[PDB]
Amino acid sequence: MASMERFLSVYDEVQAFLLDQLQSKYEIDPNRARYLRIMMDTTCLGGKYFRGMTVVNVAEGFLAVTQHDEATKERILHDACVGGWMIEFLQAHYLVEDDIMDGSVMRRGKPCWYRFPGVTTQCAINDGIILKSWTQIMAWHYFADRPFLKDLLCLFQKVDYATAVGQMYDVTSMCDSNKLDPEVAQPMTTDFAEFTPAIYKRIVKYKTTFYTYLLPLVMGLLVSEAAASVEMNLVERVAHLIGEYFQVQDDVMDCFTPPEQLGKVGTDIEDAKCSWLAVTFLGKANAAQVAEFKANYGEKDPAKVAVVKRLYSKANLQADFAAYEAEVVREVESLIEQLKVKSPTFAESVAVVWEKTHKR
Amino acid sequence: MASMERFLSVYDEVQAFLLDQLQSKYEIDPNRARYLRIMMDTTCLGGKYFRGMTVVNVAEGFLAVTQHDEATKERILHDACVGGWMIEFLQAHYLVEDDIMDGSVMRRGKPCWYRFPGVTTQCAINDGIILKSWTQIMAWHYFADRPFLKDLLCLFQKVDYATAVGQMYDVTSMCDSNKLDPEVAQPMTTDFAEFTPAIYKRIVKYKTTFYTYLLPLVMGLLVSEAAASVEMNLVERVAHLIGEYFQVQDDVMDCFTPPEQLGKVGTDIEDAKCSWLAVTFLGKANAAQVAEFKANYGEKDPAKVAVVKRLYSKANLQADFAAYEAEVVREVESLIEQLKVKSPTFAESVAVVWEKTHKR
Numbered sequence: 001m002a003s004m005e006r007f008l009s010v011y012d013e014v015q016a017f018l019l020d021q022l023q024s025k026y027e028i029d030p031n032r033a034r035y036l037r038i039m040m041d042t043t044c045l046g047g048k049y050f051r052g053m054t055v056v057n058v059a060e061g062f063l064a065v066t067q068h069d070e071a072t073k074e075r076i077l078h079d080a081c082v083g084g085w086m087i088e089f090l091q092a093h094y095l096v097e098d099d100i101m102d103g104s105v106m107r108r109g110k111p112c113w114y115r116f117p118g119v120t121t122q123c124a125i126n127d128g129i130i131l132k133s134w135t136q137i138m139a140w141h142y143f144a145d146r147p148f149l150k151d152l153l154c155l156f157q158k159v160d161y162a163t164a165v166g167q168m169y170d171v172t173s174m175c176d177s178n179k180l181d182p183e184v185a186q187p188m189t190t191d192f193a194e195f196t197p198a199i200y201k202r203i204v205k206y207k208t209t210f211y212t213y214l215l216p217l218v219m220g221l222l223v224s225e226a227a228a229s230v231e232m233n234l235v236e237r238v239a240h241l242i243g244e245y246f247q248v249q250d251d252v253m254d255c256f257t258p259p260e261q262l263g264k265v266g267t268d269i270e271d272a273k274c275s276w277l278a279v280t281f282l283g284k285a286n287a288a289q290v291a292e293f294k295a296n297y298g299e300k301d302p303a304k305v306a307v308v309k310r311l312y313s314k315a316n317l318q319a320d321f322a323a324y325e326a327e328v329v330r331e332v333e334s335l336i337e338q339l340k341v342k343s344p345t346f347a348e349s350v351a352v353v354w355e356k357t358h359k360r
Numbered sequence: 361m362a363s364m365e366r367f368l369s370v371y372d373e374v375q376a377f378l379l380d381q382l383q384s385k386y387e388i389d390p391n392r393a394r395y396l397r398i399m400m401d402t403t404c405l406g407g408k409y410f411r412g413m414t415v416v417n418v419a420e421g422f423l424a425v426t427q428h429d430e431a432t433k434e435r436i437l438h439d440a441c442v443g444g445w446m447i448e449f450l451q452a453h454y455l456v457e458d459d460i461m462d463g464s465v466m467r468r469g470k471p472c473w474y475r476f477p478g479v480t481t482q483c484a485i486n487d488g489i490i491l492k493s494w495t496q497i498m499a500w501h502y503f504a505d506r507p508f509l510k511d512l513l514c515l516f517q518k519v520d521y522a523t524a525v526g527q528m529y530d531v532t533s534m535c536d537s538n539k540l541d542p543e544v545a546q547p548m549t550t551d552f553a554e555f556t557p558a559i560y561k562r563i564v565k566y567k568t569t570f571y572t573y574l575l576p577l578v579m580g581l582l583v584s585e586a587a588a589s590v591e592m593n594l595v596e597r598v599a600h601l602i603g604e605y606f607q608v609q610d611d612v613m614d615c616f617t618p619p620e621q622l623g624k625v626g627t628d629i630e631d632a633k634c635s636w637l638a639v640t641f642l643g644k645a646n647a648a649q650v651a652e653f654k655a656n657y658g659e660k661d662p663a664k665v666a667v668v669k670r671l672y673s674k675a676n677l678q679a680d681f682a683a684y685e686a687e688v689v690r691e692v693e694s695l696i697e698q699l700k701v702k703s704p705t706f707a708e709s710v711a712v713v714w715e716k717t718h719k720r
């Protein structure tokens with residue numbers, strides 16, 4: 001059976017389980033079940049399923065080199081699909097909540113969930129809470145007897161927490177750290193002194209890389225009972241490296257990719273985000289260019305946004321990106337080589353993860 | 361050592377652990393640590409700690425009748441305090457998010473967290489996510505080797521989920537179920553046909569009773585390794601009974617308790633909430649009174665709110681409440697008696713829980 005169709009069939013199965021359990025154990029009525037069914041589909045489906053399918057792909061790799069009864073192969077693949085959906089539902093939670101937090105309009109070419117006429121923010125905040133709660137309902141049901149349950153739950157929690165911490169780093173990235181204070185309304189930074197590579201790295205590591213790259217890779221190892229086929233420090237290093245590169249692409253595309261292909265109107269400049277573009281620009285600008293950036297960044301005024309984009313274009317950031325990319329290629333290849341000492345199979349799953357990121 | 365001071369000392373210990381782990385493992389800077397410290401204090405402290413202290417009180421009861429080394433007594437009490445704080449932090453999550461969802465102004469006489477000038481909704485939604493994430497960080501750290509870890513995590517998840525489901529029942533309680541539809545803006549009910557005792561019961565059971573009464577009682581049993589001293593079906597029945605009574609008091613006070621003692625301006629009428637007052641009023645009103653209720657309920661206009669309050673006062677709901685109360689006293693006493701078959705100690709902890717609710 002093809003991996004994607006297996007993964008999609010498991011979605012339908014998990015959805016049916018969750019809704020049927022709501023009816024049998026939580027007293028749900030059919031109309032609210034339908035609302036939640038639509039909410040699940042609208043918030044969980046429509047992406048590429050890169051994260052969930054990486055769990056499946058890692059598990060598939062180990063199945064090719066490990067002796068198992070057929071029924072065991074099917075159990076491992078089913079577990080990998082359920083684990084994958086846990087990650088996809090975790091992402092769905094964070095997308096719903098982040099779109100509300102940021103006042104976003106569109107995502108993947110459709111209105112953000114909270115903007116649907118029959119949803120509203122009051123409902124959508126709680127819908128997002130339910131989405132993450134479903135990840136745990138899945139795990140406790142499908143993985144109840146599994147030897148990896150404890151390790152899986154502990155990892156999933158740490159990744160969830162890291163993502164929330166990353167969200168805090170992101171939403172506060174345009175404020176001066178020494179001025180953070182719940183009692184006092186927060187001004188935007190004027191010096192941009194915290195727009196550094198190391199601080200940018202910290203936002204991205206926590207907000208993006210743990211859930212997008214580390215969690216799918218390690219979840220694939222866990223459901224395969226294969227954590228001894230890897231040096232975990234290498235897995236973390238390669239996950240953080242590829243994840244940062246992924247976010248850099250995303251930051252570049254926010255500014256320069258047309259809205260129709262982006263599926264949204266990018267607002268990183270108006271939002272004063274600590275983006276790779278802003279950090280790299282400030283790392284090469286002269287005094288006059290810095291001053292012009294300061295006078296225009298973080299303002300909705302389309303003229304000032306236009307000034308920032310022209311500053312980026314004139315600054316030849318394409319060349320900094322090519323140098324960054326070449327360095328990432330160097331390091332990802334080195335880590336893939338270190339991963340072969342213990343598992344050619346896992347190293348190849350990482351190579352596939354890298355190829356799908358680098359040529360997306 | 362007195363129970364409350366032990367519980368408060370454990371708060372300081374847990375807080376120090378969480379913040380120190382953020383510095384050692386999550387790359388936090390001192391200013392963001394301070395923000396999170398203030399957020400924790402502001403959202404977790406200032407209540408009565410009824411929920412957390414019930415864990416401690418249940419554990420204390422069993423310590424009086426069970427043979428243990430002194431060090432074991434201290435471990436059990438420390439575990440009960442950590443478990444109690446898990447519940448208090450779970451509540452804090454739901455209060456932060458519910459205040460944002462509902463546009464609330466005040467809570468316990470202070471502005472809601474999201475209204476602090478230096479917080480804002482963008483931050484506060486994520487702060488609420490962090491609060492619940494902290495419940496899991498606590499459990500995995502303090503309970504890592506504990507025999508009750510799995511049962512505790514599984515129970516906590518089900519209660520978290522039930523609460524989110526209850527939140528959905530609450531926010532949708534003034535809409536017609538057959539008209540729920542993410543695509544279509546939701547009108548308020550005109551017939552109030554779903555303002556029934558059974559539907560009200562369902563909102564309250566899930567939104568309030570699981571986390572407020574069932575979870576503290578069962579958590580006390582778990583950290584005491586005492587689940588065999590109870591019939592769990594009795595524990596659930598008594599928890600749901602006392603919890604409903606607690607919410608009924610809350611609903612009455614929303615309308616009739618002065619704002620200064622309430623610590624907020626009650627808006628259940630304007631919010632068109634399915635409150636005990638509205639359900640009980642509709643259960644006894646004549647046709648003219650129903651029509652006047654319909655023309656005035658769920659509107660911000662203070663004149664129309666005033667009409668609803670006069671309808672409630674004229675309807676002699678105090679007498680329905682006294683009859684409801686007397687029936688609850690009957691049933692709570694019956695269940696406490698059934699609980700004595702297996703544990704006088706646990707039955708007495710429930711009697712204390714009931715006394716603190718009934719005479720609050």
Ligand SMILES: CC1CCN(Cc2c[nH]c3ccccc23)CC1
Pocket residue numbers: 094095098207208247250
């Ligand atoms: C949770 C927050 C919003 C999502 N972001 C990661 C991210 C970057 N580009 C994406 C495209 C699609 C889906 C997710 C992403 C991390 C912070």
Ligand SMILES: CC1CCN(Cc2c[nH]c3ccccc23)CC1
Pocket residue numbers: 454455458567568607610
């Ligand atoms: C999470 C939502 C808001 C809180 N509510 C329970 C509740 C009723 N009265 C209270 C007074 C103080 C603290 C909590 C409560 C359950 C739904």
Ligand SMILES: [Zn+2]
Pocket residue numbers: 098099101102170
């Ligand atoms: Zn965001």
Ligand SMILES: [Zn+2]
Pocket residue numbers: 250251254
């Ligand atoms: Zn982006």
Ligand SMILES: [Zn+2]
Pocket residue numbers: 458459461462530
């Ligand atoms: Zn509410």
Ligand SMILES: [Zn+2]
Pocket residue numbers: 610611614
């Ligand atoms: Zn209330």
